[PDB]
Amino acid sequence: LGGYMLGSAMSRPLIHFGNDYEDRYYRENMYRYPNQVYYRPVDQYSNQNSFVHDCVNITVKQHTVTTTTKGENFTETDIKIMERVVEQMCITQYQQESQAAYQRA
């Protein structure tokens, strides 16, 4: 991910758990953990969460393996709220990227 194409900036699509702390965890996990992912622009595969959750196997990394250990509290909850959002928006930006390829076409 020395390059990649930062998978847009979704500003958090609001994933809302209707929680106090785990919600908030995600709501801060929009900053500590981002609302954008690390991947290059795709529209040449079938599976989404494959390439997508992989882009987060990049993103959540950079954002939880140093970006979190900078004084954040990441628990199993953080993993999900973060991977889940960052993944499903990498997925959102997968279908977006797909059609973005249609726009650049």
Side-chain angles (χ1 to χ4, degrees):
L1 54 303
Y4 277 6
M5 95 85 215
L6 205 117
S8 194
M10 46 85 166
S11 309
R12 199 36 63 96
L14 295 306
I15 296 287
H16 31 70
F17 300 94
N19 286 209
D20 295 85
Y21 205 59
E22 302 186 61
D23 197 84
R24 192 287 177 140
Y25 254 142
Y26 127 71
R27 91 157 287 131
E28 49 160 313
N29 136 82
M30 160 278 320
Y31 183 85
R32 38 192 209 127
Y33 299 117
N35 44 89
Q36 45 216 332
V37 269
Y38 285 104
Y39 69 96
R40 66 151 176 151
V42 61
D43 176 52
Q44 58 192 211
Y45 297 110
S46 305
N47 194 324
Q48 282 93 150
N49 64 84
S50 193
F51 176 89
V52 158
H53 204 106
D54 193 70
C55 97
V56 334
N57 284 331
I58 338 287
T59 295
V60 326
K61 298 348 183 67
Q62 326 289 327
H63 268 267
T64 202
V65 315
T66 298
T67 293
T68 293
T69 52
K70 51 70 151 189
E72 244 71 308
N73 300 144
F74 74 113
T75 186
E76 185 64 82
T77 301
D78 297 61
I79 334 293
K80 30 133 292 177
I81 45 173
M82 149 205 50
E83 299 204 55
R84 86 175 289 124
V85 183
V86 110
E87 100 117 66
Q88 70 91 28
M89 57 74 59
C90 188
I91 265 181
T92 302
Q93 270 61 271
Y94 189 111
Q95 67 186 31
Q96 171 168 327
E97 260 320 300
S98 269
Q99 121 174 150
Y102 140 95
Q103 304 193 272
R104 54 160 158 145

